[PDB]
Amino acid sequence: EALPDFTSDRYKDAYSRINAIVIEGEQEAHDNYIAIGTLLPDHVEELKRLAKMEMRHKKGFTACGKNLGVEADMDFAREFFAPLRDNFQTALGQGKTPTCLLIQALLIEAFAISAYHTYIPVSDPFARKITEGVVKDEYTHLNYGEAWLKANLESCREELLEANRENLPLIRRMLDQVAGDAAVLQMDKEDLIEDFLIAYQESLTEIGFNTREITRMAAAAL
Ligand SMILES: [Fe+3]
Ligand SMILES: [Fe+3]
């Protein structure tokens, strides 16, 4: 729990990768909400609003890197998201709204929430304020996904179980891949996992899944 030395070569190196992941994630989130507008034309003005929030998030996190004198490793970041991005693209192409929403509005928003929650107490004063701004918006995004999936659950149960089976392991893999750099940032991987699972389980509960269903799903991470 002691704060890192934000000025060290060790810290900056780790930050170059973690910062890039966040910046790429925010851009992809923008792109994803806009793409979901093609599937839900009647939601376009709300999705545009969510997409605009993501660009604000991206600008803020970009400024966090600049503030520490770090250059973001964007190639690393693009590779990091590729497996999940490919799955989102595949679902979009097939018109699989429930899967697109599970990927972006549940899994990724829960991952971000957990990351940002865990980062705040060990963040530098500039980044801390930016990150504290963003976490409220994550709940808005989660709530948007939750509401649509809740309203449509009975037509998409099976697809959501499939989407979870395929994509939850990818979040696990991402956590495994980021954990070393996150530890340099004084973030405990066990905190990241706990917060992610709590957020995701709470979203599934809101949508209408029962305890047994959620347990069977969280297990897919296997
Ligand atoms: Fe965001
Ligand atoms: Fe978001």
Side-chain angles (χ1 to χ4, degrees), residues 2-51 53-70 72-78 80-128 130-135 137-171 173-200 202-221:
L3 291 183
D5 177 3
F6 305 118
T7 76
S8 75
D9 286 345
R10 170 173 166 277
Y11 187 88
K12 284 187 190 164
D13 174 62
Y15 209 80
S16 66
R17 287 182 297 281
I18 293 297
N19 190 54
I21 285 163
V22 166
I23 291 166
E24 181 65 23
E26 308 290 347
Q27 179 65 54
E28 295 193 16
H30 167 278
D31 297 346
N32 288 346
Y33 284 124
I34 293 307
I36 291 164
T38 71
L39 302 180
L40 298 173
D42 59 316
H43 286 231
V44 156
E45 297 301 338
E46 182 161 38
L47 287 159
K48 279 168 51 184
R49 265 188 79 259
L50 303 184
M53 297 182 211
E54 300 295 4
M55 295 306 294
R56 268 185 295 276
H57 301 168
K58 188 195 184 188
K59 280 187 195 160
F61 293 128
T62 295
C64 293
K66 293 298 189 171
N67 177 66
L68 297 185
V70 165
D73 189 351
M74 293 309 291
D75 290 332
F76 185 81
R78 282 177 207 115
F80 179 85
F81 278 103
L84 194 60
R85 184 172 61 248
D86 285 350
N87 285 0
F88 184 96
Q89 297 309 304
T90 294
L92 175 65
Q94 290 168 355
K96 291 184 170 175
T97 315
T99 298
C100 293
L101 283 168
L102 187 146
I103 293 172
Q104 176 60 49
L106 304 192
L107 291 175
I108 295 163
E109 299 296 347
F111 191 21
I113 283 157
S114 167
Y116 300 152
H117 278 337
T118 305
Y119 177 56
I120 282 165
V122 292
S123 67
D124 77 79
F126 178 96
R128 190 173 299 212
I130 286 158
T131 310
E132 287 170 342
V134 167
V135 282
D137 287 351
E138 316 303 62
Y139 282 117
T140 298
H141 298 171
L142 279 165
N143 288 346
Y144 173 79
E146 285 165 6
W148 193 91
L149 293 167
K150 189 179 186 178
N152 293 282
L153 177 59
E154 298 313 314
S155 77
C156 70
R157 272 170 190 279
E158 285 310 304
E159 176 179 340
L160 291 187
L161 298 178
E162 183 66 19
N164 178 79
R165 175 186 282 110
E166 300 303 300
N167 297 289
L168 182 61
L170 298 184
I171 302 291
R173 185 161 77 209
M174 280 151 73
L175 281 157
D176 290 339
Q177 283 163 359
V178 81
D181 288 332
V184 173
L185 271 57
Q186 282 287 76
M187 300 167 70
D188 188 343
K189 190 184 182 182
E190 286 184 22
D191 291 336
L192 285 171
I193 291 164
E194 179 188 299
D195 266 14
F196 165 75
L197 287 172
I198 287 295
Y200 188 45
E202 288 173 345
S203 290
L204 297 176
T205 291
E206 177 57 27
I207 286 160
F209 289 103
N210 66 41
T211 297
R212 271 184 179 268
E213 291 173 313
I214 294 171
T215 296
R216 195 182 193 100
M217 293 169 84

